[PDB]
């Protein structure tokens, strides 16, 4: 199963003991500089990435604003403030301002999907797609069609206190 990779995580994030859950903490932890660590944006990757095949996981989501999750290409830039956009190699859903969004660019796409509790992510590296479904009825939330050309990692971001993300298999 998937687990969050502590050496990637922004030092303000708090990862649960079982490495399934993430929230934003009160201050930056004193953690080693690592070139793979997101030092400004509030991101963390899973420890496993994928270069072929089809892969599923699920993400339980908080009801309060401040999260985004999906996939990132391995070459996503880790240092300094970087845009949270498909061009930077992030393909994600987000809860911000009480609305759900697919993080398209230059404008995000508001999703009229109703309340979300847990989302299934379906990554298909053979056809080139990442898709998101609300698990209660498997309604389709969004699909990004991408010709992935490198290893792709599950991506999580929490930029506000009071919300969370948690991996499930």
């Amino acid at each position: 199963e998937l687990t969050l990779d502590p050496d990637t995580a922004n030092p303000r994030l708090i990862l649960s003991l079982d490495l399934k859950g993430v929230r934003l903490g009160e201050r930056a932890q004193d953690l080693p500089n690592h070139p793979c660590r997101f030092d400004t944006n509030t991101r963390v990757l899973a420890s496993c990435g994928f270069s072929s095949g089809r892969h599923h996981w699920e993400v339980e989501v908080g009801s309060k604003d401040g999260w985004a999750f999906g996939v990132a290409r391995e070459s996503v830039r880790r240092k300094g403030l970087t845009p949270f956009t498909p061009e930077e190699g992030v393909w994600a859903l987000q809860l911000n301002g009480g609305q759900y969004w697919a993080v398209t660019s230059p404008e995000r796409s508001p999703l009229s999907c109703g309340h979300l509790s847990r989302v299934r992510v379906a990554l298909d590296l053979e056809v080139g797609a990442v898709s998101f479904y609300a698990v209660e009825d498997m309604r389709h939330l969004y699909t990004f069609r991408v010709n992935f050309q490198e290893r792709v990692f599950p991506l999580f971001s929490v930029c506000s206190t009071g919300t969370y993300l948690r991996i499930w298999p």
């Binding site: 400004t40 944006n41 509030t42 911000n96 971001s157 930029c159």
Partner: peptide, 4 residues
């Protein structure tokens, strides 16, 4: 949101 800027730091997402």
């Amino acid at each position: 949101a800027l730091f997402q």
